[PDB]
Write a protein that binds this DNA or RNA. Structure first.
Ligand code: K
Ligand code: MG
Ligand code: MG
Length: 103
RNA sequence: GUUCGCGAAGUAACCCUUCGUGGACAUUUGGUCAAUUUGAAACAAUACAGAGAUGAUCAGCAGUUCCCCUGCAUAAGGAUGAACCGUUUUACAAAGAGAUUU
């Protein structure tokens, strides 16, 4: 498929334009947000992935699978202290959800 | 420059003409900006494609958007103005049961 960094940049531009267009036209599709963040984790660009999860939380902070995905994504890449800040924030905004406490 | 005053020479003329000189009058413009190509107007042309619903053709009216255009416009029109068609995996458990690590 992709043989060169410039070709990776072309691929990333096309996919980012696709995902951003759909999330512009309909921001409330949380699964679309999740798989865009997953795309950026596949690109190993954790800054972009974190930004997408944060924007998704700004669209809807009450949606528990989005929180769990973000926390698990931080832990999967050994970013434990980021995960600690994130989980503390998660319980701080939603203290009555048992799943976040257990996580 | 005009004018008030005082000295020198016309004109012993104290006013008029000239020269020297003290004072008053009048007091800070304009630029966000330089005169052709390299600080960004658009159509048109050319080639190829081509018409929302669906079996076919067409009237529309909306909605979402970090697209706007025409219009005095909160009217109306722009193909129903366009973009929309794609992509889709975990808040993941319980009971068994068969191969097997220990
Ligand atoms: K029509
Ligand atoms: Mg209309
Ligand atoms: Mg419309």
């Amino acid at each position: 498929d992709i043989l060169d960094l410039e070709e990776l940049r072309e691929y990333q531009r096309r996919k980012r334009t696709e995902y951003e267009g759909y999330l512009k036209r309909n921001r409330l599709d949380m699964g679309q947000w999740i798989r865009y963040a997953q795309f950026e984790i596949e690109q190993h660009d954790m800054r972009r992935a974190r930004s997408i999860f944060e924007r998704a939380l700004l669209v809807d902070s009450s949606f528990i699978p989005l929180w769990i995905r973000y926390i698990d994504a931080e832990l999967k890449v050994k970013c434990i202290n980021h995960a600690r800040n994130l989980m503390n924030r998660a319980i701080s905004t939603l203290p009555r959800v048992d799943k976040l406490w257990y996580k």
